[PDB]
Motif scaffolding. Structure first.
Motif, PDB file in Angstrom:
ATOM      1  N   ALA A 235       0.914  -1.181   0.103  1.00  0.00           N
ATOM      2  CA  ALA A 235      -0.074  -0.045  -0.110  1.00  0.00           C
ATOM      3  C   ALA A 235       0.729   1.204   0.122  1.00  0.00           C
ATOM      4  O   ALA A 235       2.131   1.197   0.483  1.00  0.00           O
ATOM      5  N   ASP A 236       0.407   2.366  -0.463  1.00  0.00           N
ATOM      6  CA  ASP A 236       0.890   3.701  -0.504  1.00  0.00           C
ATOM      7  C   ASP A 236       0.059   4.501   0.407  1.00  0.00           C
ATOM      8  O   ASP A 236      -0.781   4.977   0.083  1.00  0.00           O
ATOM      9  N   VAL A 237       0.669   4.425   1.724  1.00  0.00           N
ATOM     10  CA  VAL A 237      -0.202   5.330   2.916  1.00  0.00           C
ATOM     11  C   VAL A 237       0.446   6.445   3.315  1.00  0.00           C
ATOM     12  O   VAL A 237       1.570   6.179   3.895  1.00  0.00           O
ATOM     13  N   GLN A 238       0.159   7.719   2.961  1.00  0.00           N
ATOM     14  CA  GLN A 238       0.458   8.784   3.190  1.00  0.00           C
ATOM     15  C   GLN A 238       0.093   9.573   4.603  1.00  0.00           C
ATOM     16  O   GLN A 238       0.903  10.722   4.817  1.00  0.00           O
ATOM     17  N   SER A 239      -0.979   9.118   4.962  1.00  0.00           N
ATOM     18  CA  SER A 239      -1.718   9.773   6.369  1.00  0.00           C
ATOM     19  C   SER A 239      -1.213   9.106   7.311  1.00  0.00           C
ATOM     20  O   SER A 239      -0.964   7.679   7.505  1.00  0.00           O
ATOM     21  N   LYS A 240      -0.973   9.763   8.537  1.00  0.00           N
ATOM     22  CA  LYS A 240      -0.528   9.327   9.735  1.00  0.00           C
ATOM     23  C   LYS A 240      -1.769   9.308  10.630  1.00  0.00           C
ATOM     24  O   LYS A 240      -1.704   8.863  11.972  1.00  0.00           O
ATOM     25  N   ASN A 241      -2.992  10.040  10.169  1.00  0.00           N
ATOM     26  CA  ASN A 241      -4.147  10.161  10.930  1.00  0.00           C
ATOM     27  C   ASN A 241      -4.918   8.745  10.778  1.00  0.00           C
ATOM     28  O   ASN A 241      -6.183   8.908  10.299  1.00  0.00           O
ATOM     29  N   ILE A 242      -4.491   7.553  11.262  1.00  0.00           N
ATOM     30  CA  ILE A 242      -4.958   6.373  11.295  1.00  0.00           C
ATOM     31  C   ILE A 242      -5.062   5.598  12.313  1.00  0.00           C
ATOM     32  O   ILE A 242      -4.180   5.539  13.244  1.00  0.00           O
ATOM     33  N   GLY A 243      -6.178   5.255  13.010  1.00  0.00           N
ATOM     34  CA  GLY A 243      -6.570   4.637  14.324  1.00  0.00           C
ATOM     35  C   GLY A 243      -5.911   3.309  14.855  1.00  0.00           C
ATOM     36  O   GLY A 243      -5.765   2.441  13.524  1.00  0.00           O
TER      37      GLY A 243
ATOM     38  N   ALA B 107      -6.181  12.511   4.946  1.00  0.00           N
ATOM     39  CA  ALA B 107      -7.460  11.521   5.096  1.00  0.00           C
ATOM     40  C   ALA B 107      -7.380  11.210   6.680  1.00  0.00           C
ATOM     41  O   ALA B 107      -6.354  10.866   7.226  1.00  0.00           O
ATOM     42  N   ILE B 108      -8.500  11.168   7.288  1.00  0.00           N
ATOM     43  CA  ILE B 108      -8.622  10.661   8.821  1.00  0.00           C
ATOM     44  C   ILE B 108      -9.354   9.340   8.616  1.00  0.00           C
ATOM     45  O   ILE B 108     -10.594   9.395   7.982  1.00  0.00           O
ATOM     46  N   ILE B 109      -8.733   8.353   9.334  1.00  0.00           N
ATOM     47  CA  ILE B 109      -9.381   6.883   9.468  1.00  0.00           C
ATOM     48  C   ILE B 109      -9.474   6.406  10.631  1.00  0.00           C
ATOM     49  O   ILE B 109      -8.199   6.832  11.573  1.00  0.00           O
ATOM     50  N   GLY B 110     -10.498   6.145  11.529  1.00  0.00           N
ATOM     51  CA  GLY B 110     -10.828   5.792  12.860  1.00  0.00           C
ATOM     52  C   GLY B 110     -10.345   4.343  13.103  1.00  0.00           C
ATOM     53  O   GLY B 110      -9.344   3.794  12.162  1.00  0.00           O
ATOM     54  N   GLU B 111     -10.647   3.880  14.408  1.00  0.00           N
ATOM     55  CA  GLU B 111     -10.171   2.703  14.941  1.00  0.00           C
ATOM     56  C   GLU B 111     -10.696   1.313  14.330  1.00  0.00           C
ATOM     57  O   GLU B 111     -11.969   1.671  13.880  1.00  0.00           O
ATOM     58  N   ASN B 112     -10.128   0.173  14.092  1.00  0.00           N
ATOM     59  CA  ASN B 112     -10.634  -0.883  13.669  1.00  0.00           C
ATOM     60  C   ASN B 112     -11.594  -1.036  12.397  1.00  0.00           C
ATOM     61  O   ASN B 112     -12.266  -1.636  12.222  1.00  0.00           O
TER      62      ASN B 112
END
Ligand SMILES: CC(C)(COP(=O)(O)OP(=O)(O)OC[C@H]1O[C@@H](n2cnc3c(N)ncnc32)[C@H](O)[C@@H]1OP(=O)(O)O)[C@@H](O)C(=O)NCCC(=O)NCCS
Ligand SMILES: CC(C)(COP(=O)(O)OP(=O)(O)OC[C@H]1O[C@@H](n2cnc3c(N)ncnc32)[C@H](O)[C@@H]1OP(=O)(O)O)[C@@H](O)C(=O)NCCC(=O)NCCS
Ligand SMILES: CC(C)(COP(=O)(O)OP(=O)(O)OC[C@H]1O[C@@H](n2cnc3c(N)ncnc32)[C@H](O)[C@@H]1OP(=O)(O)O)[C@@H](O)C(=O)NCCC(=O)NCCS
Ligand SMILES: CC(=O)N[C@@H]1[C@@H](O)[C@@H](OP(=O)(O)OP(=O)(O)OC[C@H]2O[C@@H](n3cc(C)c(=O)[nH]c3=O)C[C@@H]2O)O[C@H](C)[C@H]1O
Ligand SMILES: CC(=O)N[C@@H]1[C@@H](O)[C@@H](OP(=O)(O)OP(=O)(O)OC[C@H]2O[C@@H](n3cc(C)c(=O)[nH]c3=O)C[C@@H]2O)O[C@H](C)[C@H]1O
Ligand SMILES: CC(=O)N[C@@H]1[C@@H](O)[C@@H](OP(=O)(O)OP(=O)(O)OC[C@H]2O[C@@H](n3cc(C)c(=O)[nH]c3=O)C[C@@H]2O)O[C@H](C)[C@H]1O
Ligand code: NA
Lengths: 145, 145, 145
Positions: B8-16, B31-36
């Motif tokens: 994957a190419d994931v550039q966001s640190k905002n990951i739960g 991008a904001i992604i929550g938990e689970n």
């Protein structure tokens, strides 16, 4: 032997002679794929999956747990399957619904196949169709527009 | 922590915590992604995007700028969203149209969501549906075939 | 020059100045792509393909042999094309059916374009449409739901 593109993630050893698996495919360990298949770019193939011989899966298709594809089947690009009739996030059914695409059937581009469906031998599903009921052998089915 | 697949190419640190992002995903910095959450293979997630907790996004989905997904939402494979009602190449709107998928709603496989849409809490969108109008909370909506 | 993402497999040298090709794209050697195009993530572009200038191809689109896209065209995400009206696995037609998307036309998200189709200049195809007949220049076409 078989051709697995270096840019695919193929974890199954159960892959028949002559099969090609193209870039950016994911194939999980328990998948069974027969001989002389073409698994085109950007496909996902899960574990509880059986695919026969001489099967064409065009780009952007996912084959979920509970789906069986027989020999000589054509699956068009961006065809979608499913194994869960009333999906709710994190509510896992005891058993996934089973779909079977029978020998020589063809599913048109961007068709949507509901869970629990049988598509009979040599059927032809129109591009963009929504298949909510079994399709009889050799029948041409497409959705009203 | 969270699991980001090496492919994957994931550039966001905002990951739960507990979130999984699978092969061949793109996630842009804001991008904001929550938990689970489970972000399955072959997804694209843009910048002006908020995704809650316990969200399932199945394969081949793109979440554009202006789309918000609340907690406990299920998005089926190859579901398509949109943020531009009258698209013309290189004609960028001042503001993208906003879509919100409200808590616990489920969107069936290969559904198409028009721009500016609200899908209410615990709604169920049929596989292959075209959603051109808001769907009320707890309503089951599917397109005529 | 042009920008090819390191995570794309681009085999064509026939790519115009200003064109961007994003992650997990496949572009085969004979493809022709003009200037200032945006080929978004997860696209497949085959060999017998011509794409003009200022073309937007959103994520998850495949452009097959026999498809021509003119200048200033917008192709929405997960739009599907096709070049074979009666597909059967391993039954290769002598000639693929040709599709042309004419200058400035726009195809909405998750539309399905049948083979042999012309979409006229500045046409607008609704999201989720199935296009089984030519669309006239400047016409807005969408499927009944
Ligand atoms: C379904 C299919 C095989 C029917 O072809 P056909 O029997 O020659 O039917 P026709 O082209 O004569 O069209 C008959 C009518 O059905 C309609 N129709 C045909 N295919 C349709 C489809 N996929 N969805 C909705 N309507 C369709 C036509 O609009 C026509 O309507 P009309 O009588 O009101 O004018 C073909 O149109 C199809 O969808 N092929 C699949 C293409 C594909 O996905 N290939 C793989 C990727 S290339
Ligand atoms: C919409 C849905 C929840 C309805 O299920 P249901 O309420 O049990 O409805 P039924 O199966 O009893 O079907 C009722 C009627 O609506 C039709 N129908 C059902 N789902 C449809 C759909 N998605 N699109 C068009 N028509 C649909 C059926 O053909 C049936 O028609 P009929 O009365 O003429 O025979 C279900 O069919 C569905 O689409 N689920 C989503 C599956 C999915 O995408 N899961 C995620 C991936 S696995
Ligand atoms: C086709 C389109 C341009 C029409 O917009 P419009 O002319 O303003 O039409 P309206 O919103 O006034 O809707 C008119 C009617 O057609 C219906 N309709 C609109 N778009 C439709 C579509 N794509 N499919 C089926 N029905 C559609 C509406 O439900 C409405 O029905 P009603 O009169 O019974 O209430 C637009 O809805 C569309 O599909 N845009 C493409 C969006 C897209 O894919 N963008 C690229 C990705 S962001
Ligand atoms: C639009 C469509 O599906 N048409 C079909 C057509 O593409 C072709 O499908 P098939 O997959 O069998 O074609 P092929 O000639 O055996 O292999 C070419 C396909 O392989 C895949 N591939 C090929 C290469 C070289 C690659 O790099 N990556 C990749 O994914 C996609 C190419 O379309 O023939 C059918 C009868 C036709 O219905
Ligand atoms: C067809 C469908 O969407 N069914 C759902 C089903 O797949 C499952 O979805 P979920 O994503 O939550 O399943 P999981 O068991 O948590 O995770 C498995 C998914 O993870 C993704 N994954 C998993 C692995 C191992 C991988 O390598 N790459 C990858 O993308 C796709 C797999 O289907 O459960 C739903 C209720 C069901 O509706
Ligand atoms: C949902 C949609 O298609 N809306 C369009 C919108 O995304 C935008 O499309 P366009 O592709 O021209 O946007 P851009 O701003 O030039 O480039 C951003 C796109 O580039 C692609 N991209 C971008 C980056 C940074 C990436 O890493 N990977 C990747 O694929 C997808 C991004 O949406 O503008 C249209 C008018 C709109 O219709
Ligand atoms: Na699709």
């Amino acid at each position: 032997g078989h051709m697995i593109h270096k840019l695919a993630d193929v974890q199954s050893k159960n892959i028949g002679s002559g099969t090609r698996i193209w870039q950016f495919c994911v194939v999980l360990p328990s998948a069974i794929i027969g001989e002389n298949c073409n698994i085109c770019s950007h496909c996902f193939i899960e574990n509880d999956v059986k695919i026969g011989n001489n099967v064409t899966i065009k780009c952007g298709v996912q084959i979920w747990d509970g789906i069986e594809i027989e020999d000589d089947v054509f699956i068009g690009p961006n065809v979608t399957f499913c194994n869960d009739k009333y999906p709710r996030s994190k509510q896992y059914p005891k058993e996934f619904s089973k779909t079977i695409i029978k020998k020589g059937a063809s599913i048109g581009a961007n068709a949507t196949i509901l869970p629990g469906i049988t598509i009979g031998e040599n059927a032809m599903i129109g591009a963009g169709a929504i298949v909510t009921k079994d399709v009889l052998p050799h029948v041409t089915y497409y959705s009203k527009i």
